[PDB]
Amino acid sequence: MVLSEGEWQLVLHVWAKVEADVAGHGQDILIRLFKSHPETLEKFDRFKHLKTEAEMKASEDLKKQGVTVLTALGAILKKKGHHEAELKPLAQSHATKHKIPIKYLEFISEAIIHVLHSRHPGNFGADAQGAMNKALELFRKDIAAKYKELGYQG
Numbered sequence: 001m002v003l004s005e006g007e008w009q010l011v012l013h014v015w016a017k018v019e020a021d022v023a024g025h026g027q028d029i030l031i032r033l034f035k036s037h038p039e040t041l042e043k044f045d046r047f048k049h050l051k052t053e054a055e056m057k058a059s060e061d062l063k064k065q066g067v068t069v070l071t072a073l074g075a076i077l078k079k080k081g082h083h084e085a086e087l088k089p090l091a092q093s094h095a096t097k098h099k100i101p102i103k104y105l106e107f108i109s110e111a112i113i114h115v116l117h118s119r120h121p122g123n124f125g126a127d128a129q130g131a132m133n134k135a136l137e138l139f140r141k142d143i144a145a146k147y148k149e150l151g152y153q154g
Ligand code: HEM
Pocket: 040, 041, 043, 044, 045, 046, 068, 069, 070, 072, 073, 089, 090, 093, 094, 098, 100, 104, 105, 108
C-alpha cells in the first residue's frame, strides 16, 4: 500500500501536535493499551507488576518507555513510507528478543488512535483518522513481512 501525499500530510499534521508533549502522549497510549489488553503488560518485565492505573501513571519507567516508543514511531512516519532501514532493527528485537505478535501491534495501533481522537478532536476528524489508520496498517504490514524473513510468526 501507498499513502498519497495528502494522507501523509494529515498524519504528520496531527503528529506535530503529539510532539508538543511526547512523554504525556506516551503514557496515555501505554496505559490505554495495558488497560484494554492486560495480557500485553506481561511482556514488559520491568513493569508488569504494576497493579493499577495510578501505579502506571506514577511509574517513571513506563513513561520513559512511552517516549522511546513514540520517538521511534515518529521517525518511521516522517519517512512517509521509505522506512526500510528504520524497520529492520525494530523488527529484529520485537520478533527475536521480546516476541511480540502482530496482534499486539494491532492493539497498540488501536490505543494510538483512541488517544489521538480524545486529545486532538479538531485535527483528528474522519479523514485524518483514516489516514493514520492507513499509515499504521502500512507499518504493520511491513513489519509482519520482516518477521517472516526473520523466522517469526505472522
Ligand atoms: C508502535 C509500535 C512499537 C514501537 C515503535 C516500539 C518501539 C520499541 C523501541 C524503540 C524499543 C527499544 C529498543 C528495542 O528493544 O528494540 C522497544 C522495546 C520494547 N518493546 Fe516495543 N515498540 C512497539 C510496540 C511494542 C508492543 C506492542 C509490545 C508489547 C505488548 C512491545 C514490547 C517491547 C518490549 C518488551 C521492549 C523491551 C522493553 C525494555 O527494555 O525492557 N513493543 N519497543
